[PDB]
């Protein structure tokens, strides 16, 4: 236990969920790599340390304790070596930029229009539930082969998987403080299996262009498929972050633009600025804020801490994206911030595989939104509330517009 960080003993899980930024501002200044008692783990808070751990030859992927309870094995985020290579080879084809460009417009734009058509004449909406999350999950759901799973269900699953994977609080002995907080995740996985098992049954016999059918068949000997147990954890990885994050990215971007009304106006008038707006939104409130981790594979010194082999380090990329070593006034959304590298997609061998896809999903969603509702205003009756330490995003985004 590090004496000058005794105050970390009093940091609570709820505090980190409500707003982790004050604690992490202290961490970035005091201890870029610091053992946080309630999390039971070292956490990397600065860009330099997060990038170093994520790319180091002396680290490899590890799933967090709560992530492991949520996804099991072999979750693509938590494995290495040959299994990771296979799972990356499995997911990467549909995510290849040239492939995404072939169909992303015809995938996402009709979906965005569909959800827009339900409310664009109302003069008010709650964009997280009515637009950002449905576009995000409907787009990926259709890509995966889950066309028949309604957006409400996909959204419920990622919400439950989120809370399960981020159920990280531990007591003084390192045991989960809230062991009952995984049951809901277990329930969501049971539901998912009930839906996806017959789809897999079908895809084994009748492959199609769905991503999950390709996960079963691609690269396999004739007549063989990857075992469903082998791919289910990566399905869960998708049904959490891949479903959740584009929607949170677009919503956080809107919140940031609303916080800079002149920049909102600039982006509406010039939608070519939407990619920049999104990249700044992801830096400003990173959707994957501290969900993943790495484990040292040999003794290594990181930020002056001599870590034994086998030491987990949580990658709080959301804090790294407020590193004042890199950014001026990082808590302020600023479209006109110089484009600098950011860590919202992680780094290294286990960096986000779906960056190009995700950026286009968010781009197209905001393009259609601003075209349909160019006079969007935030419902300033209250502030926007953001929630989450592992994954972070606005819980709601009430807007209005003159009809
Ligand atoms: C704005 C949206 C998204 C953000 C901010 C995001 C961010 C991230 C981050 C931070 C990680 C962990 C990287 C690390 O630990 O170093 C990750 C992993 C991953 N993401 Fe993305 N993600 C997004 C959307 C998506 C989508 C839509 C997909 C799939 C279509 C996807 C697929 C993956 C995969 C497969 C991994 C695991 C990579 C590995 O462990 O090898 N992501 N993502
Ligand atoms: C792409 O989905 C994830 C990424 C990182 C951690 C958990 C996830 O479900």
Author numbering: 5 to 407
Excerpt from the publication:
The closest contact is with GcoA-F169, which forms a hydrophobic interaction with the C6 carbon on the aromatic ring of guaiacol. A broader survey of variants at the GcoA-F169 position (amino acids S, H, V, I, and L in addition to A) confirmed that GcoA-F169A exhibits the best catalytic performance in terms of both specific activity and reaction coupling, although other small side chains (S and V) also permitted reactivity with syringol, suggesting that these may permit syringol to assume a reactive conformation at the heme. Each protein variant also crystallized successfully with guaiacol and the structures showed that the orientation of the bound ligand remained consistent with that of the WT enzyme. Furthermore, comparison of the surrounding active site architecture confirmed no significant deviation from the WT.
GcoA belongs to the CYP255A family of cytochrome P450 enzymes. Our recent characterization of a two-component P450 enzyme system consisting of a reductase, GcoB, and a P450 oxidase, GcoA, demonstrated that it demethylates diverse aromatic compounds, including guaiacol (which can be derived from coniferyl alcohol and represents the aromatic functionality of G-lignin that must undergo demethylation), guaethol, anisole (methoxybenzene), 2-methylanisole, and 3-methoxycatechol (3MC) with similar or greater efficiency than other O-aryl-demethylases described in the literature. However, GcoAB shows poor reactivity toward syringol, which can be derived from sinapyl alcohol via high-temperature reactions and represents the aromatic functionality of S-lignin that must undergo O-demethylation for further catabolism via ring-opening dioxygenases. In the present study, we hypothesized that substitution of GcoA-F169, which has the closest interaction with the bound substrate, may relax the specificity of the enzyme sufficiently to permit the O-demethylation of S-lignin type substrates.
